[PDB]
Amino acid sequence: GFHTINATWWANITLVGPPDTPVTWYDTQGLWFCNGSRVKNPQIRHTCNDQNLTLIHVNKTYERTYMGYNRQGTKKEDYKVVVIPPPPATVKPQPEPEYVFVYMGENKTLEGPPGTPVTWFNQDGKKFCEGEKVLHPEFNHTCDKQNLILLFVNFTHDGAYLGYNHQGTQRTHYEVTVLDIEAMLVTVTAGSNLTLVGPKAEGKVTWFDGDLKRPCEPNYRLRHECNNQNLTLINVTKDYEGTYYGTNDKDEGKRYRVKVN
Amino acid sequence: PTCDEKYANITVDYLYNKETKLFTAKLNVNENVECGNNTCTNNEVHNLTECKNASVSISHNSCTAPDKTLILDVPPGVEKFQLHDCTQVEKADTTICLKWKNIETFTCDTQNITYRFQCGNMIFDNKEIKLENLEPEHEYKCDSEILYNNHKFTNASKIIKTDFGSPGEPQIIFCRSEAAHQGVITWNPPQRSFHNFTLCYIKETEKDCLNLDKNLIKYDLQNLKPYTKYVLSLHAYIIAKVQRNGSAAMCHFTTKSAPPSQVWNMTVSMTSDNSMHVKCRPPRDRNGPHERYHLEVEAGNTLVRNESHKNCDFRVKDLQYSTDYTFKAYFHNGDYPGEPFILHHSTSYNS
Amino acid sequence: PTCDEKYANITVDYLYNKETKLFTAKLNVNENVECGNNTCTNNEVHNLTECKNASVSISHNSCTAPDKTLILDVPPGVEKFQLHDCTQVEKADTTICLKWKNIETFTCDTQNITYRFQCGNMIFDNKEIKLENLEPEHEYKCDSEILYNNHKFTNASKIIKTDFGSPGEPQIIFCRSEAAHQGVITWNPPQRSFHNFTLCYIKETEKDCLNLDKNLIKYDLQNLKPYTKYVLSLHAYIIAKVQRNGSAAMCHFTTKSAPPSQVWNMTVSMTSDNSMHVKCRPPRDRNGPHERYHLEVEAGNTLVRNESHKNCDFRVKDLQYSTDYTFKAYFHNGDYPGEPFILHHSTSYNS
Ligand SMILES: *[C@@H]1O[C@H](CO)[C@@H](O[C@@H]2O[C@H](CO)[C@@H](O[C@@H]3O[C@H](CO)[C@@H](O)[C@H](O)[C@@H]3O)[C@H](O)[C@H]2NC(C)=O)[C@H](O)[C@H]1NC(C)=O
Ligand SMILES: *[C@@H]1O[C@H](CO)[C@@H](O[C@@H]2O[C@H](CO)[C@@H](O)[C@H](O)[C@H]2NC(C)=O)[C@H](O)[C@H]1NC(C)=O
Ligand SMILES: *[C@@H]1O[C@H](CO)[C@@H](O[C@@H]2O[C@H](CO)[C@@H](O)[C@H](O)[C@H]2NC(C)=O)[C@H](O)[C@H]1NC(C)=O
Ligand SMILES: *[C@@H]1O[C@H](CO)[C@@H](O[C@@H]2O[C@H](CO)[C@@H](O)[C@H](O)[C@H]2NC(C)=O)[C@H](O)[C@H]1NC(C)=O
Ligand SMILES: *[C@@H]1O[C@H](CO)[C@@H](O[C@@H]2O[C@H](CO)[C@@H](O)[C@H](O)[C@H]2NC(C)=O)[C@H](O)[C@H]1NC(C)=O
Ligand SMILES: *[C@@H]1O[C@H](CO)[C@@H](O[C@@H]2O[C@H](CO)[C@@H](O)[C@H](O)[C@H]2NC(C)=O)[C@H](O)[C@H]1NC(C)=O
Ligand SMILES: *[C@@H]1O[C@H](CO)[C@@H](O[C@@H]2O[C@H](CO)[C@@H](O)[C@H](O)[C@H]2NC(C)=O)[C@H](O)[C@H]1NC(C)=O
Ligand SMILES: *[C@@H]1O[C@H](CO)[C@@H](O)[C@H](O)[C@H]1NC(C)=O
Ligand SMILES: *[C@@H]1O[C@H](CO)[C@@H](O)[C@H](O)[C@H]1NC(C)=O
Ligand SMILES: *[C@@H]1O[C@H](CO)[C@@H](O)[C@H](O)[C@H]1NC(C)=O
Ligand SMILES: *[C@@H]1O[C@H](CO)[C@@H](O)[C@H](O)[C@H]1NC(C)=O
Ligand SMILES: *[C@@H]1O[C@H](CO)[C@@H](O)[C@H](O)[C@H]1NC(C)=O
C-alpha cells in the first residue's frame, strides 16, 4: 500500500517490491528508475534487482513517491520517500593571519599547512608556488613540498601570502613586511529609483545577477535602464533584492548588493 | 421573595458532550434551581437538542410565588472545527498562518459565529490569521477560540516553530586564472550556518553550476576556454523544507592566451599559369587579441615562399610549370601560433 | 316515503372475483332489501356479466309503492389490464417507465377509464408515466389504480430496481515515452463499479482502441513510430444490459528519436573530367527536428573530402584524373547519424 519512509542523509534505503518478479520501479513524474535487474537512467544513483530497489546517497532530489509494479502490473507498491536534513553545522574559522618581518638580504622560510603539497598564492592574484615546482622565477623564491623560502627579499616582497593543502580544506595566511574592489551594500526604498555606477568611461559595461540573467537584455522580468556607464532602477520592488556585478572588457568590475527596505 | 425578577438576568452556559453528542445547559447561579417538569438537578439541564426551543420552570425555595418559566435555545457547535497551520513553505521563516477547517456540517448559521485569536501579545478577530516579520528560530504559542452568541465554548492552543533561512554570505578573497584552462577561486566560509556551497560559472554565452563541500575553501576549475572571460557566483545554501540559498558573492576573471585552432574554410583557386588565390575564414577560437595569417609555399618539403597578411587573401606567382607545391596556412594571434593547415596544389604551364 | 325516493341516492360497491371472473354488487344499506324476480338476499348480488346493463328493484317494509328501479353498469374485467415496463435500456440508469395495456378489448368504451399513478411523493393521472433524475443503485416503489368512470375497480403495485451505469472516472497517474518504441501509461481504478477499461491511441493518421482487464493498472505500448505524438484516452466501462462508459481521461506524449534510414535514389552523374554531381531525396523517416546532409568522399579507402550541406546537392571538383572515388552520403537529424549510402564511381578521363 502507501507507506512513509524518512531515513537520513547518505543512507542506502531499500524499498521492497511486490512478489511475482520481475518488477518495474517508476515515479509519478515519469522518470524511469528500474526495469527488472537492468538499471535505467544512470544519472540517478540507485540499484535494482528482480523484486526490490535500493537508493544510494539520497538527498533532496529523492523526495518523491516511488511506485513498484509486478510482472503483470495488477499490484502496486507506493513509497513516499522524503529526506530530513541533518542539523546545520558551524564551520570552524581558518587560522588567523600572522605578521612576519624580514630584513634586507635575508632568506625567510614560511611553513605551509600540514599535508603535502602546499600551494602558495599572493594578494595580487598570482600563482607563486604549486608544489616543488616554482612559478614566476623573477621573484627569486623557492618552494619544497612543505614550506616557501624567499631568497634575497626585495622591498616589493611585502604583501600577503596564502598557503593551501592539496584538498584546500585548511589555510595559512602570512603578511610579509620588509624592514630596511570591495562590494558595496546599498539599501533602496521600495518604489524609488536607484543609481549604480559602473566601470570607467573606457569600454562597454556588462551586467550579471545572482539569477545569472543579464538585466540589460530585452524582455527582462524587471524594469531597468542601462547606459554605457550607469544602471538605473525604476520603481524598485521586493524582487530587486540580490547582487549585481558590472564589469567591462578591461578586467574591471564592481559588485553591488541591493537590499530593499 | 419573588422569583420572577431574581432569575430574569440569569446566564446559561451550554456544554457539548462527545460521548453522547448532547447539550447540557448550566445556570450561573450558586443556589439550587428546582423543577418539576424536567430533571434539573443541582444547576445543570441535560438532554437538549440543538436548534430547538425548550421551556423550563425556574423557582427557588427562598423566593415565593409567583413562579416563572424560561425558554432556551442551543446553537453552539464545538468540535467540527480543526486548527491547521497554513504557513507557506517558501516564507515559513517569518510568516505564520492559522486557519480553521470544518469537517462536519452543522445546522448553525455562520452569522452568529466569531473567531478570536490571542497570539502572545497580539489579539485578532478573523477566521484565518497571518503573521509577518517574525523572528526566526523562535517557538511561539497561540490560542484560538470560537464564540457563539458571545460565549466561550471552544478553545484550542497551538505551538509553532519557525524554520531556518537566510544563510551566507561567502566572502570571495580572489578569483583568477593563470593558465589557459585552469582557474583558481579562493573564498572564506560564512559565519552563519549553511550546507553545501553552490557555485556557478558563466562564460559569454554558456553557464554551468555545481556544489562544493562546506570544508574546502579553495577550488580549481578545469576545461576552460582560453582567452575567455568568466564570471563566478558562489552562495552558501542550506537545505530546509525549502532550500534557502542566501546572498551570493560574484567575481570575474579572464583566462590567459593559448595557441588557436586550425584555420577554417581553406579555399584555393587557380587563375593564371602560376598564380593561385588562397583565402580562408578566421578560426572559431581566436585565443588572441590580434589577427594575422601566415601562408608558406614549399616544394619537395623545402620552404621557398613565406607571406603574412592581416587578412586571409594571398596570391602566389612566379612558380614552375606543372609543379605540385604545398601551401601551409596558419594563424598567429601574436603570442602562440596555431597549428598549420596544409594543402597540395599544382600549377599550369607556359603557352 | 316511497321506496323510489328513499333509495334514490343508493350507492353500489363492486367486488371482482378472478376464479369466476365475475363482479358482485353490494348495496351500501343497513336494512335488508328484498327483490321480486332476482334473488337479492342480504345486500349482495352475484353472477353479473361485465359491460351489460342490469335492472334491479329495491324495496323495504318501511316504504310503499313505487319500488326503486336501479340500473347498474358492470365494469370490464380486471385481468384485461396489464402493467408494462416501458423503460429504455439506454436510459435505464436514470429513467423508469410504466404503462397500462389492454390486450383484450371489451364492449365497454375506453372514454371513461382513468389511470392514476403514484411513485413516492409524485401523483399523476396518465396512461403512461415516466420518471427521470434517478440515482443509480436504488430501488423504487410505485402503485396505481384503474377507475371505471371515476370509480375504482383495479389496483396494482410494482417495484423497479435502477440498473447500474455511468462508471468512472479513472485518473491517469502518468504517461510517458522514455524509449524509441516503448511508452508507459499508468492510471488509477475508478471508485464506482466497473468491469474493464478501454484505451484509444490516436496519431496524425489512425486511431486504434484496445480493451484491458480491471486488474491491470499499467500498460506498455510497443511498436510505435519514433518521434511521433500520440493522444491516449482511457475510460472504464461496465457491461450492463447496454455497455456504460463514463467520462474519459485524456493525455498526450511523444516518443524519442532514432537514427534515420538511408537516403533514396542517390543519383551520381558526371560533370567534367574532375567534377561530379551528387543528389538524393530526403529519407522517408526524418526522425528528428533538424535536416542536414553529410557527404564523405574517399579515394583508395582513405577519406579525402568531408562536406555538410542543408540539401542533397554536392559538387566534387578538383579531383584526380583516372582514379576511383567512393561517395558516402547520409542524412543527419541533429541527434543521431543515419546509415550512410555508399556508391563508387571511376573518373574515367585522360587529361
Ligand atoms: C625584485 O623583484 C623584481 C620583480 O618584482 C625584480 O626586478 C624587476 O622585475 C621586473 C618585473 O618582472 C622586471 O621587469 C621586466 O622583467 C623582464 C626582464 O627582466 C621582462 O619581462 C620585461 O622586459 C621587464 O623588464 C625588471 O627587469 C626587474 N629588474 C631587475 C633589475 O631585475 C628583482 O629581481 C627583485 N630583486 C631586486 C633586488 O630588485
Ligand atoms: C551504498 O552502496 C553503495 C554501493 O556499494 C556505496 O557507494 C559506492 O558505490 C560504488 C559503486 O558501486 C562502490 O564502488 C563504492 O565502494 C561505494 N562506496 C563505499 C564507500 O563503499 C555506498 O557507500 C553505500 N552506502 C552506505 C551508507 O553503506
Ligand atoms: C529491461 O531489462 C531486461 C533484462 O532484465 C532487458 O532485456 C530484456 O530481457 C527480457 C527478459 O528479462 C527479454 O525477454 C527481452 O528480450 C530483453 N530485451 C528487450 C525487452 O529489448 C530489457 O531490454 C530492459 N528493458 C525493457 C524495456 O524491457
Ligand atoms: C544528490 O544525489 C544525486 C544522486 O544521483 C547525486 O548525483 C547527481 O544527481 C544530479 C541530480 O539528479 C544529476 O544531475 C547528476 O548527474 C548526478 N551525478 C553527479 C555525479 O553529479 C548528486 O550529486 C547529489 N547532490 C548533492 C550531494 O548535492
Ligand atoms: C527482495 O525482498 C524480498 C522481501 O524481503 C526478499 O525475499 C525474502 O526477504 C527476507 C527478508 O527478511 C529474507 O529473509 C528472505 O531470505 C528472502 N527470500 C528470498 C527467497 O530471497 C528477497 O530476497 C529480496 N531480493 C530479491 C532479489 O528478490
Ligand atoms: C639565500 O639563498 C641563496 C640561494 O641559495 C644563497 O645564495 C647562494 O649561496 C651559496 C652558499 O650558501 C653560494 O654558493 C651561491 O653562489 C649563492 N648564490 C648566488 C646566486 O649568489 C644565499 O646565500 C642565501 N642567503 C642567506 C642569508 O642565507
Ligand atoms: C482550553 O481552555 C481550557 C480551560 O478552559 C484549558 O484547560 C486547561 O489546560 C491547562 C494546560 O493548558 C491545564 O493545566 C488545566 O488543568 C486545564 N483546565 C483548566 C480548568 O484550566 C485547555 O488547555 C485549553 N485548550 C484546549 C485545547 O482544550
Ligand atoms: C516517517 O516519519 C513520519 C512522521 O509523521 C512517521 O509517521 C512515519 O512512520 C515515518 N516512517 C518510517 C520511520 O518509516
Ligand atoms: C554536503 O556535501 C558533502 C559532500 O558530499 C556531504 O559530506 C555533506 O553531508 C553534505 N551536507 C549536508 C548538510 O547534506
Ligand atoms: C536556490 O537553488 C535552488 C536549487 O538549484 C533553486 O531551485 C532555487 O531557485 C534557488 N533560489 C531560491 C530562492 O530558492
Ligand atoms: C614570413 O614573413 C613574415 C613577414 O611577411 C615574417 O614576419 C615571418 O617571420 C616570416 N616567416 C614565417 C615562418 O612566418
Ligand atoms: C460506450 O458504450 C456504448 C454503448 O453504451 C458503445 O456504443 C461505445 O462504443 C462505447 N464507447 C467506447 C467503447 O469507447
Author numbering:
A (entry chain C): 1 to 180, 244 to 324
B (entry chain A), C (entry chain B): 224 to 574
What does the report in the manuscript say about this coordinate set?
CD45 is a cell surface phosphatase that shapes the T cell receptor signaling threshold but does not have a known ligand. The primary role of CD45 lies in regulating signal transduction events within immune cells by controlling the phosphorylation status of tyrosine residues on various signaling proteins, such as lymphocyte-specific kinase (Lck). Whereas CD45 contains a large extracellular domain (ECD), it has no known endogenous ligand. A family of adenovirus proteins, including E3/49K, exploit CD45 to evade immunity by binding to the extracellular domain of CD45, suppressing T cell signaling.
We determined the cryo-EM structure of this complex and found that the E3/49K protein is composed of three Ig-domains assembled as “beads on a string” and forces CD45 into a closely abutted dimer by cross-linking the CD45 D3 domain, leading to suppression of its intracellular phosphatase activity. The CD45-E3/49K complex is a 2:1 asymmetric dimer, where two rigid CD45 molecules are positioned in a cis back-to-back orientation and shifted at an approximately 30-degree angle relative to each other. The membrane-proximal regions of two CD45 molecules are in close apposition, likely translating that proximity to its intracellular domains such that the phosphatase domains would be sterically hindered from free access to their substrates. E3/49K uses a “beads on a string” interaction mode with CD45: all three domains of E3/49K protein converge on the CD45 D3 domain, but each uses a different contact surface, resulting in an asymmetric complex. The CD45 D3 domain contains three entirely distinct interaction interfaces with different domains of E3/49K. The E3/49K R1 and R2 domains engage the “front” and R3 with the “back” face of D3 domains in a perpendicular and parallel manner, respectively. The R1 and R2 domains share an overlapping, but molecularly distinct, docking site at the “front” face of CD45 D3 domain with ~ 682-Å and ~ 430-Å of non-polar and ~ 596-Å and ~ 436-Å polar buried surface areas, respectively. However, despite both interfaces centering around residues Arg399 and Ile440 of CD45 D3, they use starkly different detailed modes of engagement. The R1–D3 domain interface of CD45 monomer “a” is mediated by four hydrogen bonds (H-bonds), and many van der Waals (vdW) interactions involving R1 residues Tyr26, Thr28, Gly30, Leu31, Trp32 contacting mostly Arg399 and Thr24, Tyr69, Gly73, Thr74 and Lys76, which contact around Ile440. Strikingly, Lys60 of R1 also forms additional H-bond with the other CD45 D3 domain.
